[PDB]
Paper text:
Human [name] (Recepteur d’Origine Nantais) receptor tyrosine kinase is the specific cell-surface receptor for Macrophage Stimulating Protein (MSP), a serum growth factor also known as the Hepatocyte Growth Factor-like protein (HGFL). [name], encoded by the [name] gene, is a member of the Class VI receptor tyrosine kinase family (EC:2.7.10.1) along with the proto-oncogene Met receptor tyrosine kinase (Met). [name] comprises an extracellular ligand binding domain (ectodomain), a single pass trans-membrane segment and a cytoplasmic tyrosine kinase domain. The ectodomain can be subdivided into the N-terminal semaphorin (Sema) domain, a small cysteine-rich Plexins-Semaphorins-Integrins ([name]) motif, and four Immunoglobulins-Plexins-Transcription factor (IPT) domains.
Here, we report the crystal structure of [name] Sema-[name] domains at 1.85 Å. Overall, the [name] Sema-[name] model contains amino acids Val42–Pro568 except for nine Sema residues encompassing the disordered thrombin cleavage site (Leu306–Gly314) and four loop residues (Asp355–Pro358). Of the four predicted [name] Sema N-glycosylation sites (Asn66, Asn419, Asn458, and Asn488), only the Asn488 N-glycan was visible in the electron density map, consistent with a branched biantennary oligosaccharide Manα(1,3)Manβ(1,4)GlcNAcβ(1,4)GlcNAc. The [name] Sema domain adopts the seven-bladed β-propeller fold, found in Met, semaphorins and plexin receptors. In [name], the 62-residue insertion (Pro370–Ser432) is located between β-strands 5C and 4E, and it forms a 16-residue helix (αEX1), followed by a long loop that packs tightly against the outermost 4E. The [name] motifs of [name] and Met adopt a cysteine-knot fold consisting of two small antiparallel β-sheets and four short α-helices. The interdomain contact area between the [name] Sema and [name] domains embeds ∼385 Å2 surface area. [name] intermolecular interactions generated by the crystal packing reveal a potential mode of ligand-independent dimerization, mediated by the Sema domain.
Numbering used by the authors: 42 to 304, 315 to 354, 359 to 568
Amino acid sequence: VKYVVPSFSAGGLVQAMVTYEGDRNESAVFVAIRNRLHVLGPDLKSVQSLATGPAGDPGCQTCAACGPGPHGPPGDTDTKVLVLDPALPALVSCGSSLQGRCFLHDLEPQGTAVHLAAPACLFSAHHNRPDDCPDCVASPLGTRVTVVEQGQASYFYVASSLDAAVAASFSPRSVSIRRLKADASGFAPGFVALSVLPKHLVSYSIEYVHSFHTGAFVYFLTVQPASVTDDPSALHTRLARLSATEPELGDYRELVLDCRFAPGQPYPVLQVAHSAPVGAQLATELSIAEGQEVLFGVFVTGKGVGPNSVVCAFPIDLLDTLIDEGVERCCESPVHPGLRRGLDFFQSPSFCPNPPGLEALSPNTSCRHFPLLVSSSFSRVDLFNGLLGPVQVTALYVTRLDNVTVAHMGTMDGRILQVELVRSLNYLLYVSNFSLGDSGQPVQRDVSRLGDHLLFASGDQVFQVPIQGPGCRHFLTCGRCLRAWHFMGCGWCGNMCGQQKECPGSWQQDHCP
Ligand SMILES: *[C@@H]1O[C@H](CO)[C@@H](O[C@@H]2O[C@H](CO)[C@@H](O[C@@H]3O[C@H](CO)[C@@H](O)[C@H](O[C@@H]4O[C@H](CO)[C@@H](O)[C@H](O)[C@@H]4O)[C@@H]3O)[C@H](O)[C@H]2NC(C)=O)[C@H](O)[C@H]1NC(C)=O
């Protein structure tokens, strides 16, 4: 386990981290702690900082941008969302405080780094009501945001966990699609939204693990109760799919995802997820085409035999097909009976093809025009055949590198494992292990890329790790050098391990003296 020194100490537990790489070779890391946002340059040294709380503090620089104070309740600001809007380009931050409002921070050139212009408060006074708040975006219970450009407008696809206390007034809703106004004063009213019905808010809640935009859709991954009339600890994982091309939630779709250890045993609870295009080797094994986008998920049982963690692969094109087939099953032809529409937490029960709460489909109305849950689940089996054993995976980032696909897995004890993503039987193919300093705190869920390094947080620090694993020069004998994976371009120079270019006449990968 190669020791990795921290690159940045945040002064507090890192709540959120996202990166930016611009067109002009400018880049940045945005790192959020309670009450503070940090901007780092490409060398991961700080260029700027901003006070994001506490609310009703004169020193709160985001709060101050909402105009003459104060704004309440007073309280600490925990950062729930950090997202880039590349169209501007601008960072958007949204906090636990101040009704979940967001702030807009224009990116300005600063050498190879970036600096943020003074914050715009995305909350207009005369525009938000306790019963209707287009600018109430984030929930202290947690929020995922994906930004999609449609023509010359930026839309914010927002999922926010709810309960009764958060929804009472100025509620953020469950799923929404909000247009950011060009004058930076807020989001456009009239946005569309689904949320957990007040009657269900009492006992039913939804966690949002991940969100991403690929092809014509925005996808959210969720953990929630298997059923609305069921123990709120019988949890499972769902994929929610929304149109990325129209700002509408009529055809919102969910699909239950089922990963199992099957040498089988279900691992119903999603811990962390990442999607990425796969290399040719894994593509062949999954029967898809090289470079196809695959959604990878780390699952746990959520509570004897079996690994602590499994990793399942769900190719995006197959998920979309399963969903399309689910729609036809609900809405086509003669529908088979007893097929539920579902999403009872968002809408009234009904059976396909009827609209929520109804027993007939009227001729002026379309079955597909209402949200539905796909009737059968998508089941996959652990790519790693239980080989992660007792390891508790807390973070995941997948990178394609020619034919090879690598998983970079963060652990509960502060390690990174890099493993080739293949269907494994008897052993895992480790590229490299890292330790992140030696607090051994958990690796935080959210992993960012910067150039050819990945950034991971644990505790109050950010670390960088090479995507390709350690340089060839770290292999000190010929056998070791030649044991290195293909993709690294390591070859023995005679007394030295290097790339071809360091010993053009002797570089070889073939055998040892
Ligand atoms: C990166 O990180 C991984 C830590 O999770 C680590 O993986 C573990 O490595 C250890 C040491 O090799 C593995 O322990 C072996 O497991 C199998 C069990 O069948 C055995 O081959 C093996 O042989 C022996 O076990 C004997 C007991 O019968 C023991 O006395 C000997 O000492 C001998 O080791 C070990 O039991 C462990 O299973 C691996 N775990 C997992 C979850 O994969 C990697 O080594 C490390 N990789 C790199 C490239 O750095």
